[PDB]
Amino acid sequence: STGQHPARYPGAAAGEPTLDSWQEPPHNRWAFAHLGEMVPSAAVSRRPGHALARLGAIAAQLPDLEQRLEQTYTDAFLVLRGTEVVAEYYRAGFAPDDRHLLMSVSKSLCGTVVGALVDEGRIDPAQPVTEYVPELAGSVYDGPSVLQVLDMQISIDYNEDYVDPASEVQTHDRSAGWSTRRHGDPADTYEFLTTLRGDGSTGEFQYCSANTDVLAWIVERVTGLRYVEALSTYLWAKLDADRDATITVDTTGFGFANGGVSCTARDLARVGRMMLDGGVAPGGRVVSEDWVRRVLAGGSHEAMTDKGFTNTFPDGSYTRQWWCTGNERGNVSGIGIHGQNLWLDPLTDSVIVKLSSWPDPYTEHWHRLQNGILLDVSRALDAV
Amino acid sequence: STGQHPARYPGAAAGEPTLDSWQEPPHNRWAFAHLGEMVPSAAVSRRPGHALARLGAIAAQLPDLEQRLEQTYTDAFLVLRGTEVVAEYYRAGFAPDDRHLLMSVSKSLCGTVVGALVDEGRIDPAQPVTEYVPELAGSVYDGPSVLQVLDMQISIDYNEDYVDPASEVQTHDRSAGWSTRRHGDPADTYEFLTTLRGDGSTGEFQYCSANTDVLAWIVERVTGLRYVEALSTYLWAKLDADRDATITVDTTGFGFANGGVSCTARDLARVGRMMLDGGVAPGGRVVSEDWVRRVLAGGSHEAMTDKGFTNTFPDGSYTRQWWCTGNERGNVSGIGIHGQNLWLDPLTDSVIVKLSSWPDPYTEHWHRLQNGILLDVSRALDAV
8 A cells, every 4th residue: 555645636535536437426527627637638739840049149159059959859948047048949840838848857846846845844854754655664765864865865676777678667657657557567656666675775876766756755745735736836836937837647646756747948947047046936935045055065976976977077966856067167957868958057147958859868979969068058158 | 450640740650659659769759749648647837716707797687697507517607799708607626717628519629620621622521431531441431421420310330328348439438548448449549430330321310429530530531630730720720719729639649539629618619709700710711601501500300310409409400510409599509428518699699608517428407407508598698
């Protein structure tokens, strides 16, 4: 059992509705107004072919920028300097207001929600995960603190070989509805998390998507709100965003916190703006100044043993769901497979959003190219 | 085999992507920008509890209208007189701009798209269905004309007992993704349609959702456009709608034309406005004056043998995916289970939209109450 979870709607029974009961009362009153949460759906455009390139200023310092963006399968690119959009690019077929999957950049958004609750005193990072989710007792999450989840410093037996269906990475997707279920798979994301094990060691960084979903579970237990609603109340609704964001949900309505969020490039930049504004957004304070300061400061360098990161950023680290480069510019970034970045350049008070679709989820090649672009653009923003 | 279908995206292979391949290239470039079409998803509100009742004028003639709306599980109600919204009602929990499933009102929208293509000479209603969809040869759709599909005058062995999983009605839902698939089910909606049989007789009205999906299939074969896109290009994009509409899609991306469309009440009213404006919308002509005239004129009365309709509307009929009351007011309406109506009252140049969630899909009781409200509101709009 995975314990109590926020009802899909007021008064809903556990796990209701399902794909087989949404047309039945009392579920239908809610379902008829949120069918996209139950059945895959397409948008029927209210609006009746070529790339949009407005690289403005930086175009002078980076003459071949558009070509570099094309080479890295860029779908949407936006640079926000202060409160002004100084550069934009959208591939042919992708509108400026179209939404794009964030993959793991979604994690940085989840960490933000956790930070807001820490500020309220609803979550104590020093407390064990089991203080909030007792049902995780007996799993790899039995013992570690919430902070260790936030910093991903928990050793977990999590096979990342996505070509193998038995791998934890593939099983995680199936449990969440990102892939077709196989006989024996956990019923939902919560159950999948309870199956995870490890040797018990902590302290060393191990990038694992399961950690973020555990954070989302904690958020639900502490607020009583579906993660989908918590993400809106504690973050999205305070950004004065142009459009709602979306998040995939599993069979219980649990948002795939680790990587299922989609939003426009401009709106994602508002998250970065909030971070560079000390945690304050147009609709109110999202997180404390201290939380933002801790994110920018970085995590323990010794815990960071991922050569895929340190070969490029020797003094890099990870904390509270953000990657910290530790470079001379103090760059920090949300990162997602296939080329997603919510990059912060505090020196120039700028935010760089790059949403892409590389053919591969990850290769040293793509990251070298992607980081080269983000760093060059950052430097192009420097006063001269 | 069901023949050629519009690719999910430019250059996509047949049936690609699936729930198990959307993260792979070349599918991912499209998928990352339209994930809701592959995985159930929830909206993360950009906006930070009580019913909204603005029945204005008609409130005087119908003092207990709000109570009557509550009694019929009304979610959204809107009256458009001319170009002005003269009355509105939204239940607590349902915002004025929230979208609502249309169920079979979706059929009237599909018929409109067909009408637009008839105007272009791309579809000849006198032609057999097989002229456009040869793959329907050998099925109940082998012989009947496109007009007979439009008027639903084809005898089909289609069990409507939804409590029985073997029924065509339940199998139809499973084939489309509205319910969990069972071993042996057709792979998609197209395949399901090819399994339908009948005694070969035509001429008598038989309400059957399969007919509308056959129309959508014809639309795709004649335009080369996914029905989702056709619905936008030929209708939605010309309404100057406030929001996009949405439509559920099956595993191939085929929109559930017969009943999967969702939209706001105000936007649905724009469809009615177009009908009362002779087929013209703000973005251009949607259908010909003649098409609208034929819809308002009604279908053959002798073909209409559905007592569930004629007991209330003795001179009623059905044509081109619209129900024609044949009453003294010449009322015509799009109708969907659980209380959905796109009601036209030409006498007062008004459109009445009522989107609900009755606990039951259909009962003589609910329809008596619902029609009583629509008729009373219509009369309340009369000059006095």
